[PDB]
Design a binder for this molecule. Structure first.
Ligand SMILES: [Zn+2]
Length: 1048
């Protein structure tokens, strides 16, 4: 009904009658605002049934209208009227697209992109109209994630070309900076969602930089250089020599624009980022010669020297310092400048050695001229220990010594202390000094210790001088004295993390002397029974105070502390750091030049002084009662109670680890009872929040508690005291608290509330409730995983069922960011190999995987994260086929998903990051079963074993995927005690891999712009050689075969 009215109104809009045109525009806008027409149009457009009346059809009619007025009016005041009418047309277009995109994207991106390109390309029709269309493109197309992901690579390239060509043509400043922003967004989109730009586009950037030299102003240079950094980061992986050449031919211009012209802070930061990127590319991980993996040229050396001079001059200035937050005379230089300066100093160090640094340290009058050189020396010594010569060790300290005393703490004191710490660590690392040098260093270090010991009670440089004392003790550069222990005893200084670290180092190195009394004096200083103890105020490192307390109450503290320190680490756990950086690309650069070959490479008799043990127990109790009696529902922080329970549990765990007391005895001890009472008094807060959850002030405390509890537990399988403490703490919990946590998780899960495009998993869409729910879910997953090896009060099966009830087809909404986050966390954490889940739970976990893969298709980042989080289920699958039907069903589901991804990667559908995530998933599948008994991908009715599929990636276009497949080709020659696969399989796999590498080389080799594919030749040869080396090193069957292949 209404659609007929809209059609009539638009057909009348097509007519060339001005008064009527205006009346029909008013009627059309009113009908746009009509909810009935809105719902009819959106339903018919989502139907895609060709009803001739959708948002696209009315958009086409509006375009015809606009073309009608443009053609009619093509034939001062007239210009003003024209620009005003164009502004009105732009406003109408913005209003139309706003209404058509109010709820969901109902406008196809191709039509809008073509309209924008058509308007922008023509230099006529006023620059204001083009600026408005650029604004609508930047704020209504690139901002929508669906439009961000569904734009084809050809459209990306066309947008980049058109807008960069417009940028090169001179225009106004505001339009120029808008075009620069659009160019930056387009470069980010093209480099993140599709294949990267062609290297020839690099020419464009160079031209812009040249203009920067000619015209004094810098209009949008920051955005252009940010786009250049993105382009170089995505292009240097497999175009290293080309990037080196372009850096060589653009960097002098950047140095000139830095020096001759005075610029802003943002441009300085982006230029420093470019310089650091070029340093990383030329000298990956500080390689200072060609034989050790560096690309070197005379021009690059001259650039290095000139840029060192420029950085020295910049350091000499005043604006290159920290922000004057409420004044305070911020004296330190920014971290990026110091890091760049240290890297260049490492790459440069005939008269420009350490003598320059020593002279600057000696002849600097004010602290303003002294602190930057202390920072430079500190960074250079810390990052590159070999930089400082042994013969220069003795002199430098002398200068540093004269920089230490001022009769009071000064502005340069923390920096002098840090430099002394770094020098001490380097000297401990050296271990090749001469006797005279050792004696002179011993005398200097004794003098430095004497100077530093005075003023230890400053309380403003506590961390720095405690670190210095700890480093000196660790290096054994001086023997400790009675006053050093008196520093800990007598409550002279408040306990803190640096203090306990120094105490740990002292206990490890030296033996505690008498004056028994000293030991329990230290213990009472720690516990400090007194309005809260200092330990409970701050989060100490896990199992440090407990280790010190246990080691103190032993026959020999040194041996006990050494036993605690000498504990093996967990190989598959380690720690999480540097999630994203360029360092993996530097690793790749070292790998290609074959300068980093990674694929080839309990005690008894402990006894306890009893009286010390009851003293420790009575102190721990006294603190426990002190917290328990002086406890209220709001007066005391509950994380304090959790910390006290963790301390008691850790003390018990260390005691059990050394075997002085039995594990059964620990449960019967009153320490466990007090820990249980403290945990219950902490859990009443969770219960109270479960009662009412609309508050927000409790969320921070609850999040702190959940993070602390998560840190308390562990999933490790070694014999460390970590395991014993985690088991004790997990037995400490009760069923009521677990049920309340699960109920809160369920309540928060079903909660409703209401540079171009941000990721769905950006941690910005998440609210405080979402973060609390994520922390609680992580804690619950750790509990249910670890409880499988303990007899615990709460039932792990019920909690696991409650967790799996969250991912249900009747409730799960994969569109919402919180639901995707929780499903990814469930995939990441729930499956286990030590105690596998029953296959029914695996089926329940894998049921919604296909749906979330389908909804988030065409999104590269989400697919990459999904693969990364689903590769953890393979270790659970294929485990003895306990339930046959369920096992085959789960394997079929997982293999269908993996086959869908592989089939899509056969086409030009997924970018290199998704492909290498898939390569990692295939590696996990190969490790699950070396024999393709069940891991077979079914595509288009044809079956492919994963063995033959894995070698297909050795001929991939992107170098990262090729090297990832090559360095892990040993999974086809080993069981992974590593058992060797049968001879036939090994020979067939080696032959297939060799043929794949040779086929890639031959396909690349034939002509195809060899100045640009010199890098391709180098990369393919490196891939082949790495494959041969890995095969030769791993499999002993094919040593002769690999050697003859190498000779051939
Ligand atoms: Zn472990």
């Amino acid at each position: 009904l209404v659609l007929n009215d809209l059609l009539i109104c638009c057909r009348q809009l097509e007519h060339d009658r001005a008064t009527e045109r205006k009346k029909e525009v008013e009627k059309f806008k009113r009908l746009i605002r009509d909810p009935e027409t809105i719902k009819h149009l959106d339903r018919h457009s989502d139907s895609k049934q060709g009803k001739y009346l959708n948002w696209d059809a009315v958009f086409r009619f509006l375009q015809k209208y606009i073309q009608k007025e443009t053609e009619c009016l093509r034939i001062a005041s007239t210009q003003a009227s024209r620009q005003k009418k164009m502004q009105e047309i732009s406003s109408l277009v913005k209003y139309f697209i706003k209404c058509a995109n109010r709820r969901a994207p109902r406008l196809k991106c191709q039509e809008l992109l073509n309209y924008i390109m058509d308007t922008v390309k023509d230099s006529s029709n006023g620059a204001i109209y083009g600026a408005d269309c650029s604004n609508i493109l930047l704020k209504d197309i690139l901002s929508v994630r669906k439009y961000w992901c569904e734009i084809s690579q050809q459209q990306w390239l066309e947008l980049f070309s058109v807008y960069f060509r417009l940028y090169l043509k001179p225009s106004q400043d505001v339009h120029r900076v808008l075009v620069a922003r659009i160019i930056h967004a387009v470069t980010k989109g093209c480099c993140s969602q599709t294949d990267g730009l062609n290297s020839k586009f690099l020419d464009f950037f160079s031209k812009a930089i040249q203009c920067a030299r000619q015209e004094k102003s810098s209009s949008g240079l920051n955005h252009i250089l940010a786009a250049l950094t993105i382009f170089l980061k995505t292009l240097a992986v497999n175009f290293r020599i080309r990037v080196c050449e372009l850096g060589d031919e653009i960097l002098p211009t950047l140095l000139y624009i830095w020096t001759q012209h005075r610029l802003n802070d943002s441009l300085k930061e982006v230029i420093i980022e470019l310089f650091q990127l070029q340093i990383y590319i030329h000298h990956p991980k500080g390689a200072k010669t060609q034989e050790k993996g560096a690309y070197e040229s005379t021009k690059w050396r001259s650039i290095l020297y000139n840029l060192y001079d420029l950085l020295v001059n910049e350091i000499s200035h005043i604006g290159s310092r920290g922000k004057y937050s409420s004044g305070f005379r911020n004296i330190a230089v920014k971290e990026n400048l110091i890091e760049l300066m240290a890297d260049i100093c490492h790459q440069v160090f005939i008269e420009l050695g350490w003598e320059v640094i020593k002279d600057h340290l000696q002849k600097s009058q004010n602290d303003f001229d002294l602190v930057p050189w202390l920072q430079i020396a500190t960074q250079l010594i810390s990052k590159y220990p070999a930089s400082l010569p042994n013969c220069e060790l003795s002199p430098l300290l002398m200068i540093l010594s004269q920089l230490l005393p001022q009769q009071r703490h000064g502005e340069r004191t923390p920096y002098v202390l840090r430099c002394l710490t770094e020098v001490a660590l380097c000297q401990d690392k050296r271990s090749n000094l001469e006797s005279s040098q050792k004696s002179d260093l011993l005398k200097l270090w004794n003098k430095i210790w004497c100077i530093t010991f005075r003023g230890i009670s400053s309380e403003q440089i506590q961390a720095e001088n405690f670190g210095l004392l700890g480093a000196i003790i660790q290096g054994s550069l001086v023997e400790v004295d009675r006053e050093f222990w008196k520093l800990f005893t007598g409550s002279a200084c408040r306990p803190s993390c640096p203090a306990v670290c120094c105490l740990t180092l002292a206990l490890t190195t030296s033996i505690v002397p008498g004056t028994f009394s000293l030991k329990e004096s230290i213990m009472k200083w720690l516990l400090f029974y007194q309005e809260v103890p200092p330990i409970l105020h701050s989060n100490f490192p896990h199992l440090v105070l407990e280790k010190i307390l246990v080691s103190l109450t032993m026959k020999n503290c040194k041996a006990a502390m050494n036993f605690f320190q000498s504990v093996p680490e967990c190989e598959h756990h380690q720690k999480d750091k540097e999630e994203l950086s360029f360092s993996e690309v530097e690793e790749l650069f070292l790998q290609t030049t074959f300068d980093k070959m990674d694929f080839l490479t309990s005690s008894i008799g402990f006894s306890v002084h009893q009286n010390l043990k009851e003293s420790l127990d009575r102190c721990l109790l006294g603190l426990s009662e002190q917290l328990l009696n002086n406890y209220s529902s709001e007066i005391t922080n509950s994380e304090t109670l959790v910390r006290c329970s963790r301390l008691l549990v850790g003390v018990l765990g260390c005691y059990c680890y050394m075997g002085v007391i039995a594990e059964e005895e620990a449960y019967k001890s009153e320490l466990f009872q007090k820990a249980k009472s403290l945990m219950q008094c902490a859990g009443e807060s969770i219960t109270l929040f479960k009662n009412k959850t609309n508050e927000e002030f409790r969320i921070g405390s609850l999040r702190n508690m959940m993070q602390l509890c998560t840190r308390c537990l562990s999933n490790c399988t070694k014999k460390s005291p970590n395991k014993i403490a985690s088991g004790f703490f997990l037995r400490l919990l009760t069923s009521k608290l677990m049920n309340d946590i699960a109920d809160i998780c369920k309540s928060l899960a079903s909660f409703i509330k209401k540079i171009g495009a941000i990721n769905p998993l950006a941690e910005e869409y998440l609210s405080k409730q979402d973060l609390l729910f994520l922390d609680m879910l992580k804690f619950l997953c750790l509990c249910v995983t670890t409880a499988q090896t303990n007899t615990v009060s709460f039932r792990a099966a019920d909690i696991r069922r409650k967790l799996l009830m969250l991912i249900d087809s009747s409730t799960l909404e994969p569109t919402k960011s919180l639901h995707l986050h929780m499903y990814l966390m469930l995939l990441k954490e729930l499956p286990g190999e030590e105690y596998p889940l029953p296959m029914e739970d695996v089926l329940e976990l894998l049921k919604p995987l296909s749906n979330v893969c389908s909804l988030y298709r065409r999104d590269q980042d989400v697919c990459k994260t999904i693969l990364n989080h689903v590769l953890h289920v393979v270790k659970n699958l294929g485990q003895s086929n306990m339930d046959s039907e369920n096992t085959r069903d789960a394997q079929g589901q997982f293999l269908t998903v993996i086959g869908a991804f592989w089939h899509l990667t056969k086409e030009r559908k997924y970018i290199f990051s998704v492909r290498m995530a898939l390569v990692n998933c295939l590696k996990t599948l190969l490790e699950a079963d070396p024999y393709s008994k069940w891991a077979i991908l079914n595509v288009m009715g044809k079956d492919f074993p994963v063995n033959e599929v894995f070698t297909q990636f050795l001929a991939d276009n992107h170098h990262q995927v090729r090297m990832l497949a090559a360095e892990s080709i040993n999974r086809l020659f080993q069981d992974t005690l590593l058992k060797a696969l049968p001879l036939k399989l090994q020979q067939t796999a080696f032959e297939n891999a060799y043929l794949k590498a040779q086929e890639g080389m031959r396909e690349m080799s034939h002509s195809a712009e060899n100045p640009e594919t010199l890098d391709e030749i180098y990369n393919r040869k490196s891939v082949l050689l790495t494959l041969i080396a890995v095969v030769l090193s791993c499999s002993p069957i094919c040593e002769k075969q690999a050697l003859f292949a190498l000779c051939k």
